[PDB]
Design a binder for this molecule. Sequence first.
Ligand SMILES: O=C(NC1(c2ccc(F)cc2)CC1)c1ccc2nc(N[C@H]3CC[C@H](O)CC3)c3nccn3c2c1
Length: 354
Amino acid sequence: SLDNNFYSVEIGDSTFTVLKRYQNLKPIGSGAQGIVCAAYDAILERNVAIKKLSRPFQNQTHAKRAYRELVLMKCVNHKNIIGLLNVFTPQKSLEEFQDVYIVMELMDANLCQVIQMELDHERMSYLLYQMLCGIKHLHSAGIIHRDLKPSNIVVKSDCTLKILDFGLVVTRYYRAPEVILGMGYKENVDLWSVGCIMGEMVCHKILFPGRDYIDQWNKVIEQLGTPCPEFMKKLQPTVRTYVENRPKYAGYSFEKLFPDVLFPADSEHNKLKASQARDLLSKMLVIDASKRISVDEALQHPYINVWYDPSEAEAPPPKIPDKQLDEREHTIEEWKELIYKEVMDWRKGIITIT
Ligand SMILES: O=C(NC1(c2ccc(F)cc2)CC1)c1ccc2nc(N[C@H]3CC[C@H](O)CC3)c3nccn3c2c1
């Protein structure tokens, strides 16, 4: 059947081996962790995105990432998190296991492309509201992202927004000071990243585009200002010296960083205001996380709260199957077995004698 026969297609320098239900494959990314194709799903009669994770067990980092992705995509079912349509491997044993394919509903655009548009307050607010909903949903299951960025967020033609991944040529620009400086963190680490996306949406420029972490920290302090001694005292001694030795900067007020001229044209009497967006930016782009807003407070902010719906913002938490995502270490072979088991568990949840 279309659901049990495989065929192979060359996509650049890689072979995609997928169920025959998936037709007319066309590359749509990516780099670093694998390739993603658009396809027509002849059974569902609609378009899908198919990503190939090549040897996700190759090392601890790829492994723990692939595993988290499979488990979370499966147990989450939320408007603002990409859903899992199908998962499979073409290889027929643990010994032979190489590749995992994950199938998602195809979305029309990514957020990088949407950010480049001339947006209005209505759509900026709604996109931000949805990002905050997705983030809060993950946080309710104890999942803290740390690496939200526009290339990993997709958007439908009707503005529905979905986050594609679950957290941390790799893009460092959206990572919080906690991350840059190797500090402890809490949930509002993700709110820094939202601030960076929001800032970029407004000014059509990456806010902190460092070539590395040194350059990125420099751009943070040059624009927001050197943090206060109370923050400095929170740094572990090995990092505090570096931070305290940088040249000192006063930074710019948010009225200087984000003046009215950057906001939508002819929008002085909209329901939402540039001053509200600027106020929210000023509470998310706060170096000291203990002074930065929480997600809940962001959802209640005047720029965002227009859209507030408890079914989206107070949804029942995802149920992560018992102890499945604990802190434990595993060998590469152990990770390989865990990921194979997760792929095969998908079949076990579908097969029936009716
Ligand atoms: O899974 C995706 N990216 C990640 C990834 C990709 C590959 C991989 F091996 C491991 C992880 C970070 C998760 C991904 C990338 C691009 C994705 N691009 C999509 N749509 C395109 C938006 C831009 C348009 O120009 C063409 C369609 C789309 N619709 C549903 C899911 N997606 C996409 C998912």
